[PDB]
């Protein structure tokens, strides 16, 4: 393999953690126009072994480390300290492009499980827009399935491996922290249409079957672990939100999820703990498109008319893999 560039239509003046870094590490691009398609061509793909994923993982780590400075970091009994000014934080689109001597193949088969032969191949010079969204359980601001929902795993029969779902219909989520009013400045809530959401599962579940015969599926909350993977976590405006999804995973109104702002977090960049400064004042509010989930399946028990699925995640490579699956780098020969 080889190292790639990237691309970002990010402003030079707008001082925001993503933009300022994007301005000093990318290019606007690109050579028009489209993906030159191939016909009657067959090519092998493998989403789970794709060097572009590893390269992306390293870049986003560098961004956060240079952008969101924790005041204190603890790893292996060692303490690191630095300035931790509050910053503005918000996702930016990103494309990855190939250098002189390589090209990026793109699989266009609508129903693709990530492995095997692709019959509608093409060749772009750079990828689609990727939002470097760091989160657990729920994938936000991603790309939608072309037709109906699609699921992918390294081995569905193996319970240790995560199942990646790709929705075909976005579910908008509004999280807000009111100006508090004798109130807890860390108390926030998330609202989503109950009616809208009670139809997305009705389509995922149908496809979760079929693989597991006519077993009945039940969703339960996380079995336990760090608070960060038991709850739906994400970064909003530099602030860290943690949302209880029990009502979301209990098998025609509104779902209201309770939230907490935390200053102490276990790092995704490295095994350890980090502390950020207290939350800013005023309203903190973010609207995002839910486009996917990460699931793990309860094993052990036999076909007791249930397999049971619980929210997972943690390895942010899975977040990157969910978007980068349909690409591969090749050498011209």
């Amino acid at each position: 393999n080889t190292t790639l560039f990237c691309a970002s239509d990010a402003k030079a003046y707008d001082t925001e953690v993503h933009n300022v870094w994007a301005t000093h590490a990318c290019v606007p691009t690109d050579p028009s126009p489209q993906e030159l398609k191939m016909e009657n061509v067959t090519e092998e793909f493998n989403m789970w072994k794709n060097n572009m994923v590893e390269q992306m993982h390293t870049d986003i780590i560098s961004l956060w480390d240079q952008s969101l400075k924790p005041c204190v970091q603890l790893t292996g009994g060692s303490a690191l300290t630095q300035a931790c000014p509050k910053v503005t934080f918000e996702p930016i689109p990103i494309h990855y492009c190939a250098p002189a001597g390589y090209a990026i193949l793109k699989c266009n088969d609508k129903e693709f499980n990530g492995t095997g032969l692709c019959k509608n191949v093409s060749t772009v010079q750079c990828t689609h827009g990727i939002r470097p969204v760091v989160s657990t359980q729920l994938l936000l601001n991603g790309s939608l399935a072309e037709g109906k929902v699609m699921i992918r795993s390294e081995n569905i029969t193996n319970n240790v491996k995560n199942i990646i779902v790709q929705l075909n219909e976005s579910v908008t989520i509004n999280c807000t922290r009111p100006n508090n009013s004798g109130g807890d400045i860390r108390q926030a809530h998330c609202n989503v249409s109950g009616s809208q959401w009670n139809k997305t599962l009705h389509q995922v579940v149908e496809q979760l079957r079929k693989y597991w015969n006519n077993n009945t599926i039940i969703f339960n909350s996380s079995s336990g672990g760090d608070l960060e993977i038991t709850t739906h976590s994400f970064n909003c405006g530099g602030e860290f939100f943690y949302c209880n999804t029990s009502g979301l995973f209990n098998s025609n109104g509104t779902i209201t999820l309770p939230c907490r702002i935390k200053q102490i977090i276990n790092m995704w960049q490295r095994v350890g703990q980090a502390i950020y400064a207290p939350p800013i004042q005023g309203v903190i509010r973010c609207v995002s498109n839910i486009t996917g989930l990460i699931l793990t399946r309860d094993g052990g028990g036999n076909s007791n008319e249930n397999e049971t699925f619980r929210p997972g995640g943690g390895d942010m490579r899975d977040n990157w893999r969910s978007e980068l699956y349909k690409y591969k780098v090749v050498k011209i020969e």
Epitope: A12, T23, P28, T29, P31, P33
Partner: antibody
């Protein structure tokens, strides 16, 4: 071959607006970034901003409180607006093409328009 | 913010001589550097991009090398038309230029 020609009023008084235009002949504006660069007397070149498709220009930090760049696609021309000019904006102003990645260097260049700001 | 520094600031050279001028960036910029030629009263002209690749039409006596923070423009044998002020430019970020290197004729 491709030619960049510039026009616009170059004698201004303080607090007025500088408005220059650059026409492109031999090529369309499509799929190309189009940029402005200025050169104060006896000093180095300074990037003002660039743009390809209407709805996403990119400007210098020190000027974005004052600068507008826009495309006139039907005539294959583009323009630079600069509000609240002072003596410090006295310079030769150039327009220049900026093709798609990785052809990022500015090329070709217009002949430049002399702009003098004084009362 | 990234800063471009050209050296030397001022060169005096005879016709026929070889000359090499350098441009140093305050932080790494890999090969995202270009050189322009500008004569007095005239617009800059593209000479080299991607550190070492000549623009079509540029004479073979020109060449360039470098990557990261140290870059090079070389003329193997000067002709009268080459005497001018040369600017380097960071091709991304703030698109900042060097302060320029003036090449004058010795006599």
């Amino acid at each position: 071959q491709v030619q960049l020609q510039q026009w616009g009023a170059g004698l201004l008084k303080p607090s007025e607006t500088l408005s220059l235009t650059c026409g492109v002949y031999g090529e369309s504006l499509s799929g190309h970034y189009w940029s402005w660069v200025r050169q104060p007397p006896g000093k180095r070149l300074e990037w003002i901003g660039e743009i390809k498709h209407n709805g996403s220009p990119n400007y210098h930090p020190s000027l974005k409180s004052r600068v507008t760049i826009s495309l006139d696609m039907s005539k294959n021309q583009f323009s630079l607006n600069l509000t609240s000019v002072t003596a410090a904006d006295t310079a030769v102003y150039f327009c220049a093409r900026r093709s798609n990645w990785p052809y990022l260097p500015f090329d070709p260049w217009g002949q430049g328009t002399l702009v003098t700001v004084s009362s | 913010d990234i800063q471009m520094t050209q050296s030397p600031s001022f060169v005096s050279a005879s016709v026929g001589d070889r000359v090499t001028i350098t441009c140093r960036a305050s932080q790494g910029i890999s090969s995202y550097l270009a050189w322009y030629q500008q004569k007095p009263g005239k617009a800059p002209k593209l000479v080299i991009y991607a550190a070492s690749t000549l623009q079509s039409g540029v004479p073979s006596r020109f060449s360039g090398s470098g990557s990261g923070t140290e870059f090079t423009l070389t003329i193997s044998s000067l002709q009268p038309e080459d005497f001018a002020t040369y600017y380097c430019q960071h091709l991304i970020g703030l698109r900042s230029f060097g302060q320029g290197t003036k090449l004058e004729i010795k006599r």
